[PDB]
C-alpha cells in the first residue's frame, strides 16, 4: 500500500 521510499518512521 505504501511507497517504499515514503516515511518509514512514526508519524
Amino acid at each position, epitope marked *: 500500500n*505504501v511507497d517504499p*521510499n515514503a*516515511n*518509514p*518512521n*512514526v508519524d
Partner: antibody
Amino acid sequence: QVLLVESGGGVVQPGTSLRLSCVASGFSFSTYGMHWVRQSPGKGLEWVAIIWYDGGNKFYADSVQGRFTVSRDNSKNTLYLQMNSLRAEDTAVYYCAKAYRTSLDKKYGMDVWGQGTTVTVSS
Amino acid sequence: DIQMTQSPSTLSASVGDRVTITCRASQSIASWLAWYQQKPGKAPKLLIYKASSLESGVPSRFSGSGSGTEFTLTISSLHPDDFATYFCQQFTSYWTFGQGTKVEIKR
C-alpha cells in the same frame, strides 16, 4: 550519539543460512525505519532491505528477493537480516543504516550507518 | 532501475585545490540525492542530503548542487582529510548508488 553495531557475519559455504544482527543505541530505535546495505568489490554499494519502524512494511532488493528476510525486535533494539540460499555473489560487507528523520518530505534516505560485518560465501 | 553514474572515477588533486565531482541519474530524481564520503576500512558517511544540504559537522568548503539528472559535489579548497572516495545516492525509487569517485593525492 547514534551507534549501530552489526554482528553475525562470517565465512560460510554456499546454500547455507546466516543471520546478521544490528544493535542500536543513542536514539529511539522503535520510532525509525532501518536499512540493510552491502558493499563488495564486484557489485559496489547495494541496498538490500528496509523495514518500517514497527516491523510491518518490508521491502527487498531484487537480488535478495525470496531468499533474505528482514525483521526487528524493538524491545531488544536489534535489527535482523536472515539470509538463506547464500551464493558466492552474496559475499560483501553488510552495513545497517537508520532512515532519515521525519520531515515534510515524501522521500527518505539514510543518515547513519554501522561499522559493518563481513559475510564471505565460498565452497 | 535508476542507474547512477559518476565521473571521473579517479581524481588527482593537491591540498588547496578546488575539485568538482559529477553524478548523473539515468532518469529524473528531482533533488532526492545524497552524497557520501568513505575512507578505506570505514563505513560511508553522509555529507550532503537532498542535493545541497550539508549535514551537521560538515565543513562549509563542501557543497552540492543539481536537480533532475545532473548533480555536482564541490570542495572549494581541498583539505588533507578530504582525500577519500565519494558516492552519490538517489532515494526516490528504492536506493541505488554511483560507482564512486576516488579523490587521490597528486604528487
